[PDB]
User: What shape does this take?
Amino acid sequence: FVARSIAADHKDLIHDVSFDFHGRRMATCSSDQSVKVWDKSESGDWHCTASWKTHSGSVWRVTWAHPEFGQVLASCSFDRTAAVWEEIVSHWVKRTTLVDSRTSVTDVKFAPKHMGLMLATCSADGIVRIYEAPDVMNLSQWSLQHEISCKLSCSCISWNPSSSRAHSPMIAVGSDDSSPNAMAKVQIFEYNENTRKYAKAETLMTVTDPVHDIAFAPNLGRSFHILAIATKDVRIFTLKPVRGPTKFEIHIVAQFDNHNSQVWRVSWNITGTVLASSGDDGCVRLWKANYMDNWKCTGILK
Amino acid sequence: DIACLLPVHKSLGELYILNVNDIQETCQKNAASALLVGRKDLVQVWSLATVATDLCLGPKSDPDLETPWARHPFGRQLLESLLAHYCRLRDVQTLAMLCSVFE
Amino acid sequence: PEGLCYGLFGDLAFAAKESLVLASSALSVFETRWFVDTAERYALAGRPLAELCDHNAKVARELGRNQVAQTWTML
Assistant: This one.
C-alpha cells in the first residue's frame, strides 16, 4: 500500500530490476552502461554499495544466481556480448565473456538449481543458446551445449521452475516481429533424454500480436503448468500433460484489457498465486484466482 | 421377539434427542447414549459429527474470500461416504438423524 | 521503459519512465507471515500420535486458521 522512493542517480532509463534469493539485495541496470547493487539496513533504507561500468552499449537485463555457487550476476547488452560477475573479498570482478552472438543479445536467464550451473541467452537473429559450467569452483570456464533456431526474432525466454522428476526441462520463447502476416509468436521446447536434444513441443497459434514478456509460475506441488504472456492484453494459459515430445492440452483462462494500452512486464510471487502486470498507463495491477477458477483483480498501484 | 436381527434399536429411539438451538450438546449426548448399547460405529460417527458441525466453520457471503468447508474433502465427501455405507445396511435410524443434524 | 520484480518477504519494485508517470526514469519500492510462526511451533516426533495431534491443533487455532485446526482433530 505504502510507496517508498529511492534515488537511482542513473543518467538514462532503467531497463531492469531484480531481487535476490534471500530478499535483501537488489540490482539495477540502465542505458548509461552501468550496473548498481543495493542493500538493506536495519533502519529500512536502501544504500548503493557498488557501481561499475560493464559494457559499451545499452544493458537490457541483469539476473542473479543461486547462493550455493556464490554471489554471481549476469548481464546482456547491445554489444552482442554477455558477462558473468562475482563478488570477492569488496568489489566485483569479471569471470567470463560470451561472444558467440552476431546481433544484439536481448535476454539472459539462469537455470533452476537442480540442473547445475546453466545459462540461456536469446538474440535478435532468432538463435537461443545454452551454456554450462562443469566445475563450479572455476567460473571462467563455460561450455556451449545446445543451439535452437526459432525462424523469427526473439525478445524473452523463461524456464520451468518445477523440481519434479516427472517433468522434463522446458523453455519458452517469445517473438516481437510486427510483420503484416499472422504467425505464431510463442514456441515451447522440451528435452528428450534418449536423443539428448531439445525439440519443439507446442505452439500457440492463438497469439499473433507482438509479445513483450513471458513468465511461468512457481510450481510448489502442482501437477500442471501455468504461463503468463504480455501483449496488447494479459493472457494466462494452462498446459496439462497427457498419459518423443510430450502432448499437452492447451487452454486459456484469462484475457484482461484493463490497461487500455500495451502491457510491458509481468511477474509472479513466491508461491505462484498472484500476478503483477505493468502497462503503458503507469499503473501496476494484481490478479488472483478463487476456488472456482475465476481470475479477478485485487489491487491497483500507481 | 426377534429384535436382534434388525438394524434399528428401540432403546436408542427412546434416548436420542434433537435440539436445534444447541447442536454441540446433542452430538455429545447421543455419543454417550451410543456407549450404553455398545455400538463402536456410532460413537466414532457422532464424535466426527461434533467437529464437522462446529460454529467456527460458518460459510461467508463473498466467494472471493475463502474456500467453503463443504468443498473440503472432510465435508460433503465424507458425509456422502457415511450415507452410502449406512444405506446398504438399511439403517434408517442413523440416516434420518444424520440428515437432520447437518441441515 | 519499465521494470518489475516481486521479491518476497515483502513487496514490489517498479521502475518507469518519467514521461509516463524523456531520458530519465523513476524507481520506487512498494510496501504491500503465517508461514514462519507455524514452522517453529509445530512438533513432528517425540510423543505418541494423540499428543502430537492436539498440540498442533492448538497452534493453528491461535494463529487464526480454523479449517486447518479441525483437520488435525479429526485425524
User: Anything to note?
Assistant: Residues 44 and 52 of chain C are 7 Å apart (CA to CA). Strands of chain C lie at 3-6, 12-17, 25-29.
